[PDB]
Design a protein around this ligand. Structure first.
Ligand SMILES: NC(=O)c1ccc[n+]([C@@H]2O[C@H](COP(=O)([O-])OP(=O)(O)OC[C@H]3O[C@@H](n4cnc5c(N)ncnc54)[C@H](O)[C@@H]3O)[C@@H](O)[C@H]2O)c1
Ligand SMILES: NC(=O)c1ccc[n+]([C@@H]2O[C@H](COP(=O)([O-])OP(=O)(O)OC[C@H]3O[C@@H](n4cnc5c(N)ncnc54)[C@H](O)[C@@H]3O)[C@@H](O)[C@H]2O)c1
Ligand SMILES: NC(=O)c1ccc[n+]([C@@H]2O[C@H](COP(=O)([O-])OP(=O)(O)OC[C@H]3O[C@@H](n4cnc5c(N)ncnc54)[C@H](O)[C@@H]3O)[C@@H](O)[C@H]2O)c1
Ligand SMILES: NC(=O)c1ccc[n+]([C@@H]2O[C@H](COP(=O)([O-])OP(=O)(O)OC[C@H]3O[C@@H](n4cnc5c(N)ncnc54)[C@H](O)[C@@H]3O)[C@@H](O)[C@H]2O)c1
Ligand SMILES: O=C(O)CC[C@@H](O)C(=O)O
Lengths: 446, 447, 419, 444
């Protein structure tokens, strides 16, 4: 009835990637310490080895994990350690790590590390949560097509001599609808690929999320299950996602629809999927993840003793099974290398703990090249009253340009930039802070 | 002199200048011959075709496979149109018995299963569907690119037999990789756009200069494409030049750990040389939809050393995807073929329209309006000799001819004429006169 | 879809060009080797008569009247090019009666009009015209009130034809939502939506624009009741036809602050020529009223007045006349049957224009019966018909014989043989 | 002869709603109600955001005489202005309660930023809210100039019918040269491509193109190859008169010039001369070297800019009075940006995006952090102040703390737990009598 102001809101005025004309960051070196020793285990990617050697750190590399007694001896001298999933950094092991500044988990998982014990010794732990997104999104595009045309079945037939040309119930993916459960890093990336392959994209999330492209958020999962040809899961493991696709969800789906799970091994009830496929309700499925997975690669590893429905699952048509290869590419392993090595490096060189999984997240803008006589104090301490009183007293002869402290449990982390400090005064500040009683670990960068 | 004002002509001062630019209802018609229309459909044509024919009111007989030769002969005696696919062989042996047949539908690309020349000689028009499977093949390839990049087939076969084998080594994200398309035709150009959207660089080789879609680039030699591509895929016709165009020297021109995809034609790759390139770790994987020798029917021991001798060798190799000519085996493709060919046969029967025919002159005329009473359409198939239009236009000379179109194709020609103000007495007279001209091959009148 | 299911899917030829047709046309004709005479305006009737007695093709635009009085003297004329949409300046029936084919350019101005509208949308949304007129007379008047970003607003297109569908894609790219009303079901481009009633479009649109023909149904189709159906402070654009809007009712809707602005390219009465006192109360009585209103953009029928449009007309019509002369192709002709044939030695093409009566193909195909006819196409248009036949193995002696025989048939209107 | 190998690897989320813990809402100590004063007809979106916080809001459509402004500002905690209200030291000296200033506009020169910072007063503005509005204006002027729309309409409004297709063009296929590929330039780029123009841009920085725009290394390459040239640059000494006689000579015959950036960036006498010589076919100007302070009837004339009578007598010139950002949507977005900024500064102490202040903020306290106070301590960047402050707070655990400096001023923000109402008053009075203190608030 009246022309009127459109819904416009200022955060939608964006700017493309450009080159700053910044001032050179001052490079900072620790007090009293010599060479940084990095130990990398479990065949971390060469991108990581390179980033560390270019800093001038000494790097020791291993393709697998170490026996516990060998790991103990090596870890005594080491300043940073990179691991993946199979190295268990327990208190038994970390108690001997007198020099360790940080731990890199070159992977998503961090449970192999006793995070709380580590924090208690002032050891920051970093990981790579989102480095595998593109690899999983592409896997799914490939499985959509592969399921749509029963590729796996065709190839297995031909490899054993059966020629079975079938158009019945095989589809062009253009025009079909993809239902994405969880519009996160993977879900939103998959959305754009799926639209490019000519699918209509619906998504269900527990949060209101701005769509990419022409994807549509649906308010209930049953709308998504009702209207989707392909349903795919990109959710975390929570109690709410635990078995969130079970018999009633498969009944809500279309006859001859398809199910894809490269999220978490718990999110699908497999006995109910097996039964939905056997009833010809579900036309095919692709699983990358299972309730129980072997610890190592091997030849009889995937069987009825690991998951009891294995012999049933294997005997079904149009089932694609993969052994957790969602993120298993050279590009992903290489990006993890860069993300985590860069993270450890910024923590060592600048004290930046943003993205740490067990630590307060603290950082400060870099000092300029030309800020002569400025020191950065990195003070990890016990989260009790009276500690900033102590510290800011010790530093009170010098102007503090800026300072940031934050806490995480029983631990806290102060970072302060102080100006006009000569080398005599630096040694004095170090020894004073080193004999405070709240101190867990201290480092000064100059 | 006037050659400076000619190099500063196709160059310019600098001037703003013009950019480089660039209802009535159809009357439905029925033949003069009594007894309707029998359609025979073989080899499991799609339901879209069955529906189009029944809605015309034709009597339709449907079969899911082909017939023995003796059964096919007896059925074809009464039939007015026959739909087939690749495995029904309409030889002269069979078509000699087809006294009523007006047209043949090939619900597929190939027409070699039909003796097209014998058919044309009897005034039988043949129709097919060349370009209906394009999207289906392009999507197959996108899926095999990813599947090969990630060794999906190998992973699944392992797990189905109980082997857990997680591998990132030489498994890749296809974003950033380069796709080399050999043959930038209907399928190649479609695949190009998909591949860019999946974040591949696309190069293509063709024997002709073709305008790129998107930001694909044409390379002048195949070896440049083989040198620069991570994935190589073939979308070419079967010519003597494409016969074994990827052999040992082309695999040596390719990258270490590159990939080969062939959903074009069974002859275009030399398989013993591919087997050898894979065994030497030169080629990291391959997907084949088509083979030199393919079984005639689906079956359990059909794909073996007796059909192609290197079968047992090929199957024992890692990261090999084998499919049984399923490039165009989708519901959407089979359904579009259904509609294209059944619409074509239907317009040929109801209106005489032979456009898109593979063995016939291509002739058609605008539909007559609903309300054009007393108008007949003459469909006269004859021998392409002088003096035939003289004869025909004489026979019709008492009636105004609203329009007429004749065209020739070899020894056969096809006249189509719309004549107004014709009563039923005069119609029978025209029919019997045209039916006893000596140039006549077959005649039909629609009113 | 409650189950996964299938998805949807030659230097003898004299050309005379009048009224300043575009150079693209002059070039196409000279590259054929035709002799070309060009004029920037039209000719007096007596001069036109003398020139036309030898002309084989004539190009005109809107102001040259090819009456029977003039065409009766055109002994050589094969065809007429209208380098424009309109053809009423030509007596089409008399022309057809002499075997003269007439061609025009209906759809060459589509992009030019669609861009004009995108510009007027923005200009009206921000009162640009008013701002500039103010400043040109010294008034500084910065105004944000009721001025809008077009992003998010809705465009209502009446008539989703060549112009409407082109405008649709532009408007979406500028971030408008597009609704359209047409009297026919038309598949949308992009994410435009067809609305089943005009009143729904008027109710839901911020900008309303007209791209319809002049029919009795479009005659004054936007009047007082349609402006009442529109939003307060909505906008009206008419670059279709001068009759389609009731202007006194638009004036009244603007005066009542119902309509916030309007752009008109077309009027009920327009001057014949450019001039200084041409647009006034004697031409349309509401002129002084219309002019005194805020946020009204007035243009003098410039919707298709670009270099690119004039240039495309040049190419379309000159190519058409050229294919008619060189190949007999009459497809796109406005007053003639539409006939053409796919374009070695010893083949002739017979072009026989004749009276549409029985017995004529009998006569003609008799005359040609010593020679094989490879193909042949005849069609009719009223009292006239047009045969085109390709005959093989013909030497120049036999060609002259066929010509003289066809030239003395009684149904004949005009004949030409191409070899 | 090649080897397949790792691609060159370079993950966001789309905007989403948080399902965190409910933010604890915080109220200042010694203060009662927050009074907001809004001048110069700020948009209703701002009035609404402030009343929903429960602030008392006084609104005016214009600016105030200096003596009235002085009296009102004595009580006021936040003031919103636009370009014409001059907040000098003369006026701000009497601002005993003022916590912050909103500039509901891009410009902040009307405010004495340094004096303000010296009294602990944070100033906020809206730099980039007008981008889309300017980009659309330009698309409209491109078309309007290409078709001489303005000239046609002026003619008809006076009774002249003048149909012209000569040197009138479809913009499809033409080239747009964007000088300054910033917020406006990059937005315009995408629009222009959609209207079928080829886009070149010149910038002093390497900027990744949107779409199929192409960065050119020199300005004269852009001037040489463009049909339409448009300016979206800041006022620097390098942009001062950056289009003058030599740049117009580098441009195409019958090309077009658009300036909705800054009033100084084009040399107008040289543009007038290029148009008169038929070098430049048309121009649109939104901005001038001298502009009137207010709307009025004889404001734009030879006394303001001497070439006015010359400029106005030329064909195909579009003149607008600084309306690049004058839309409902732009004014409304400014409303939201600045009112939200002032509100977060008042309610949470967040000074990020401040133009004259250290940029400090802390994650919100949870609903269930009972007995926590937030200390907002604006002081002098001199040694020994954190010693004093962290001493005063040393009976309480500090959960977190962030101090940063900007010249002679610094700003500490500290979250302290387990504080009852007795102890809160004690901390306030101690911090209020520290010698480094400029201003202090506590939120609890
Ligand atoms: N298969 C593999 O090898 C592999 C590799 C990488 C990641 N992953 C897994 O994939 C999943 C997604 O990774 P990501 O980075 O995209 O996650 P993300 O955290 O970026 O996003 C997950 C999404 O799930 C949504 N969500 C949470 N609970 C939900 C619920 N109950 N219903 C619906 N939506 C819900 C969240 O709102 C969010 O949008 C995780 O489980 C991750 O560990 C697996
Ligand atoms: N696998 C299947 O089920 C299936 C399905 C459909 C089509 N096909 C086949 O795919 C192929 C492509 O079909 P299309 O529709 O895209 O064909 P098309 O005719 O449109 O394109 C083929 C292209 O190959 C080019 N070409 C020919 N010889 C070449 C050579 N020696 N080197 C490089 N380029 C060459 C041609 O110039 C042309 O541009 C054909 O063999 C067709 O039969 C297979
Ligand atoms: N101003 C100019 O200089 C200029 C230039 C070119 C064309 N035009 C005119 O613009 C108009 C549109 O031209 P076009 O090329 O798009 O024509 P078109 O014939 O392609 O489009 C007309 C459309 O309007 C629809 N329509 C007809 N009557 C209708 C009605 N009563 N209500 C709603 N829809 C109706 C038709 O079905 C069709 O889709 C015509 O009048 C044409 O002559 C003007
Ligand atoms: N007319 C109005 O009402 C109005 C409205 C909004 C903005 N503006 C003005 O428009 C301009 C653009 O605003 P914005 O938000 O895009 O600015 P921005 O700061 O995002 O972009 C300016 C761009 O200019 C580039 N640059 C700087 N100096 C340059 C030079 N000498 N030559 C070329 N490029 C140069 C910068 O690198 C940057 O990319 C500013 O002057 C702004 O004040 C005017
Ligand atoms: O081209 C002309 O002569 C102007 C009028 C023209 O628009 C027409 O009648 O189509």
């Amino acid at each position: 009835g009246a022309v009127s102001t459109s819904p416009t809101q200022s955060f939608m005025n964006t700017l493309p990637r450009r080159v700053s004309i910044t001032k050179q960051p001052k490079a900072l070196k620790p007090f009293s310490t010599g060479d940084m020793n990095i130990l990398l285990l479990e065949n971390v990617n060469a991108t990581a080895i390179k980033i560390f050697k270019d800093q001038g750190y000494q790097v020791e590399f291993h393709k697998s994990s170490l026996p516990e007694d060998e790991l103990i001896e090596k870890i005594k001298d080491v300043h940073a350690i990179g691991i993946r999933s199979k190295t268990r950094l327990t208190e038994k092991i970390l108690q001997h790590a007198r020099n360790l500044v940080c731990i890199g988990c070159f992977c998503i998982g961090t449970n192999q590390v006793d995070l709380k014990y580590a924090a208690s010794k002032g050891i920051a732990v970093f990981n790579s949560p989102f480095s595998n997104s593109r690899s999983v999104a592409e896997l799914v595009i490939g499985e959509i097509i592969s399921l749509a045309r029963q590729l796996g079945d065709r190839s297995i037939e031909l490899h054993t001599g059966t020629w079975n040309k079938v158009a019945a119930r095989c589809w062009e993916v253009r025009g079909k609808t993809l239902g994405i459960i969880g519009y996160g890093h993977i879900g939103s990336q998959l959305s754009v690929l799926a639209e490019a392959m000519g699918l209509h994209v619906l998504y269900y999330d527990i949060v209101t999320i701005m769509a990419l492209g022409t994807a549509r958020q649906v308010s209930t999962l049953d709308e998504l299950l009702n209207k989707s040809d392909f349903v795919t899961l990109h959710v975390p493991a929570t109690p709410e996602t635990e078995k969130m696709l079970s018999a009633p969800q498969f009944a809500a789906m279309k006859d001859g629809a398809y199910v894809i799970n490269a999220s978490r091994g718990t999110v699908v009830d497999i006995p109910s999927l097996i039964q939905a496929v056997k009833a010809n309700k579900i036309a095919g499925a692709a699983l990358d993840v299972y309730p129980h997975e072997p610890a190592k690669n091997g030849e009889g590893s995937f069987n009825d003793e690991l998951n009891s429905w294995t012999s049933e699952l294997v005997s079904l048509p149009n089932i694609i099974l993969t052994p957790h290869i969602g993120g298993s590419t050279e590009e992903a392993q290489s990006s993890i290398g860069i993300e985590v090595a860069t993270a450890l490096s910024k923590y060592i060189n600048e004290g930046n703990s943003v993205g740490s999984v067990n630590f307060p997240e603290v950082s400060l803008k870099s000092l300029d090249y030309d800020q002569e006589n400025t020191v950065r104090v990195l003070y990890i301490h016990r989260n009790v009253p009276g500690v900033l009183k102590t510290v800011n007293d010790i530093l009170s002869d010098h102007n503090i340009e800026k300072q940031f402290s934050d806490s995480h449990g029983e631990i806290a982390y102060l970072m302060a930039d102080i100006s006009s400090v000569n080398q005599s005064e630096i040694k004095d500040i170090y020894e004073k802070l080193n004999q405070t009683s709240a101190k867990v670990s201290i480092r000064l960068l100059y």
